[PDB]
Ligand binder design. Sequence first.
Ligand code: UPG
Length: 394
Amino acid sequence: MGSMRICIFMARGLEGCGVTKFSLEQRDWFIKNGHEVTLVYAKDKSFTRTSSHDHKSFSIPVILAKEYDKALKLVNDCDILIINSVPATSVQEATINNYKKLLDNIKPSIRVVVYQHDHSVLSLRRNLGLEETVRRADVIFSHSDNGDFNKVLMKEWYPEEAPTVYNFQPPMDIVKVRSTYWKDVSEINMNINRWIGRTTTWKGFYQMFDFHEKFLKPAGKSTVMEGLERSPAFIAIKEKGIPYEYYGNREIDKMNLAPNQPAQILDCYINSEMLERMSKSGFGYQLSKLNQKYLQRSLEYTHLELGACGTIPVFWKSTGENLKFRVDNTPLTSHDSGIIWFDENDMESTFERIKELSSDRALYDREREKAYEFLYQHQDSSFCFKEQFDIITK
DNA sequence: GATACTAGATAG
Ligand SMILES: O=c1ccn([C@@H]2O[C@H](COP(=O)(O)OP(=O)(O)O[C@H]3O[C@H](CO)[C@@H](O)[C@H](O)[C@H]3O)[C@@H](O)[C@H]2O)c(=O)[nH]1
């Protein structure tokens, strides 16, 4: 019921993945709804995927370790301070020290909002100041009431009344993407299967490799996996002697899209570039197989980008089973969504589906629309940020 | 003790 000043703060730094995407998507919504916004991030630690999204023209970097004043001056110039990430466990005494001093000098007329974007305790543990950050917050959000942040970490800090933790969904303006990359069914290459994600076990990269060597490759299809970095978690792909063809983001045009080829792995990607390639690929894959406890209503940005750019979304079954439609709590697998639920113990019925859609384009374009409208209903900004804006205000 | 989950050093 009035225009406010917002400061989005990422103390971990600008990593270029989910948290960075949420902030940018948060900034756009606030701006579109009449509010002034400033996006601030700590550059004490740097990241590879720092340019995946375009923020360079408006984001404001700051070195907490040696710019406390500018930092304090920025975080105090708003009505709502939203912290999406906290210093990592490797920043250096000065950084985590000044960040803690910042939380002690945020004027009284500022409502501090804290979003916890991680899932597993293992990730939650690599945070510094997360406890102080949470106690200073006037509002807290998490991906699941039954996730680790809620059931374990909030138990360690509040064994005199524990703050409420509201649930949220990482929203995105789906229409902007569609209206920008969607293509006519004729421009799509039904033989290019494109997987996107990062090198982490719950991201289902293994099953994509398996699915390619056993179904797509043998059938003349081509597979591209975008976003795999040789993180330590990559050693396992070495031990498992899994066939592949790595490509740096510079030599993308030397990638071989012909049949009878191993999984073509792309290092890391620029988000707008990936969407363009995806909007012209027959099927996009996002096999996140997170566990029941961590799943409530939150789909991931990689999930939403697939629906939004005009491809046929191929997600992990269990995921769509545990998650619930935002409109009526019903499982995502209970709707005629057009989505193709991936079954690990039945990759043949999955492949068969892809084959059908691969033959007649009428049904294909009939399934996109249903998938798009379904993902729109479930997680577009228009709805989700308004839900959060209301919890933050009242 | 089995098992998920979590880019860096350095030279051009
Ligand atoms: O090299 C890359 C890799 C990813 N992306 C993009 O980065 C975002 C990644 O977000 P998401 O798909 O959510 O994956 P995570 O990086 O795992 O995001 C984390 O943060 C999100 C915000 O809440 C949560 O939804 C996730 O579960 C959590 O893992 C997407 O827009 C991707 O298109 C790029 O542009 N380039």
